[PDB]
């Protein structure tokens, strides 16, 4: 009897495009961008600041570039949330409590909130009871920490929580804590889970 849902961000909701990102980075002067990915892991845990991140990018980049240029290229990894997934979220809150559990960074998070979640009258606030972000939490999937940490703050029973995330390891760890999981494939429309 599932009462709650935990949803990942990437692939599951927002389409990703590594090639594009790589290319945009190269265009702005980062030659070995693809070997490079450090600060990414730190950023993800919010152990540094967007400021220091850009500096790190510049620093290993060997050139001075605009923060906008950098945010631009970094955000090009994100494509879009097909709007039918947004409908699905809203429809789902009718029968469940719905949380986001996402490994991400402030720069990305602000892009998705401005550019991807806004739909009709709705805003990121409208889809989730609460969003748990790695870089705010300071811990990241698949640390067991983060899963236990989420249920306690949320005050939800793990036995009654369904976790949807396209990373196997993340799912296996969540299962250990008693959570049920589905691992969607790239591009998968996982709406079939509720037919």
Shortest Cβ 140–Mg ion spacing (Å): 12
Tally of helices (H runs) and strands (E runs) in the chain: 11, 5
The reply on whether position 82 binds Mg ion by CB under 5 A is no
- Contact with Mg ion (CB under 5 A): which of 2, 10, 75, 129? 10
Quick one: which segment of 37-45, 59-67, 117-125, 158-166 binds Mg ion (CB under 5 A)?
158-166
Total residues in contact with Mg ion, by rule CB under 5 A: 4
Nearer to Mg ion, 71 or 165 (CB): 165
- Interacting span for Mg ion (CB under 5 A) from 9-17, 29-37, 60-68, 115-123: 9-17
The answer to whether residue 166 forms part of the interface with Mg ion (CB under 5 A) is yes
> CA nearest 159: which of 147, 168, 143, 141?
147
Which strands make up the sheet holding 97-102, listed edge to edge?
A: 130-133, 97-102, 4-7, 161-164, 180-182
Give 152 or 188: the residue with its C-beta nearer to Mg ion.
188
Structure tokens at 17: 């495009």
**Gap between the Cα atoms of 20 and 117, Å rounded:** 21
Least separation in angstroms between residue 134's CB and Mg ion is 12
Site for Mg ion (CB under 5 A): which residue of 167, 175, 180, 181? Answer: 167
151 is written with which tokens?
């249920």
Q: Does 44 bind Mg ion (CB under 5 A)?
A: no
The interface region with Mg ion, picked from 81-89, 110-118, 143-151, 163-171 by CB under 5 A, is 163-171
Residue 130 and residue 155 in contact, taking contact as beta carbons nearer than 8 Å: no
DSSP 3-state assignment of 14?
Answer: strand
Of the pair 11, 82, the CB lying nearest Mg ion is at 11
> Which residue, 61 or 116, is less far from Mg ion as judged by CB?
116
Helix ranges (DSSP H) in the chain? 18-27, 33-36, 39-45, 50-59, 67-75, 83-92, 106-115, 124-127, 134-137, 144-154, 168-176
Residue numbers of the site for Mg ion (CB under 5 A)?
A: 10-11, 166-167
């Amino acid at each position: 009897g599932i009462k709650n849902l935990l949803i990942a961000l990437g692939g599951v909701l927002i389409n990703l495009d590594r090639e594009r990102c790589i290319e945009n980075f190269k265009k702005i002067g980062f030659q070995n961008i693809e070997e490079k990915f450090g600060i990414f892991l730190q950023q993800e845990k919010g152990l540094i600041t967007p400021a220091e991140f850009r500096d790190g990018i510049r620093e290993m980049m060997g050139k001075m570039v605009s923060d906008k240029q950098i945010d631009a290229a970094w955000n090009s990894f994100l494509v879009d949330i097909p709007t039918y997934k947004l409908d699905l979220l809203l429809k789902l809150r009718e029968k469940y409590v719905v949380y986001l559990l996402s490994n991400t960074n402030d720069i990305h998070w602000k892009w998705v909130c401005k550019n991807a979640f806004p739909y009709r009258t709705f805003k990121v606030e409208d889809y989730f009871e609460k969003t748990y972000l790695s870089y705010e939490m300071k811990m990241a999937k698949p640390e067991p920490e983060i899963f236990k940490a989420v249920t306690e703050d949320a005050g939800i029973d793990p036995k009654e929580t369904f976790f949807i995330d396209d990373s196997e390891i993340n799912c296996k760890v969540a299962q250990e804590l008693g959570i049920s999981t589905y691992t969607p494939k790239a591009g998968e429309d996982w709406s079939h889970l509720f037919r």
